[PDB]
Design a protein around this ligand. Sequence first.
Ligand SMILES: C[S@@+](CC[C@H](N)C(=O)[O-])C[C@H]1O[C@@H](n2cnc3c(N)ncnc32)[C@H](O)[C@@H]1O
Length: 264
Amino acid sequence: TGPFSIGERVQLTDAKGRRYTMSLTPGAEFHTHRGSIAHDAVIGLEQGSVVKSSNGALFLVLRPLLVDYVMSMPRGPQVIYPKDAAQIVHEGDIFPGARVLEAGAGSGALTLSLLRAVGPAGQVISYEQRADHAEHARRNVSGCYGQPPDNWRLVVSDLADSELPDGSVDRAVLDMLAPWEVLDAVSRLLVAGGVLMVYVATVTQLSRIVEALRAKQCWTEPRAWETLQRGWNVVGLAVRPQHSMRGHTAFLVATRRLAPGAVA
Ligand SMILES: C[S@@+](CC[C@H](N)C(=O)[O-])C[C@H]1O[C@@H](n2cnc3c(N)ncnc32)[C@H](O)[C@@H]1O
């Protein structure tokens, strides 16, 4: 992508790690607590450059990675965390060209990883039953690209009421309070062999969705797990895990769709 251009998102990091994000606009002045930075001074610079404020405070300038962008969007429905989005893409096998169904669009954080994984030849169909939440996702997804992707369909309705054709999606991902309520729709929509990933914060949700999947009888035995992420301090002889860590985000569940009338 080269040097910074107009319209681009830029991440600024001051001398003690606070991150600031802006959209480059000629003539605009970016304001922080360590001074102000002119957008005109950043437009044209190479990534990884250090700019100086109006008060001399030094700032590192970089293009945000998708994970940086997703974690700094406006307040709204809780975004999925990076370790979980990574495994949804990977264990959910979101392949190039896939047709993916998603429900809860929420803030669109997972949506952006799903769109990146399927690429221009694939498609993402996201349901968001709340109109207000949907506007957040729509705004966040467009803000990553500069415009609405043409391979993204956002449907403002309950997924349970979906009218899409049978077997029209290759992969499905659910992040909502009550995923068992949309399982009949998912079972109809997802093709044979298709992968379903479910993200649930509590063990009561976890048990209920795994048992609902088994009761529907058209799914492989569900696989359920959690991941814990722990940062490390690696400074001279002081090499040790960090003292604070996030204890939990949510559990993951993976299952695959059986063929019409198959058992095992
Ligand atoms: C936890 S948020 C999803 C966050 C999303 N994974 C992201 O990273 O931003 C759950 C979303 O699912 C939505 N929702 C819940 N049940 C739904 C249903 N049956 N159909 C469609 N949307 C639903 C909620 O309105 C909420 O916006």
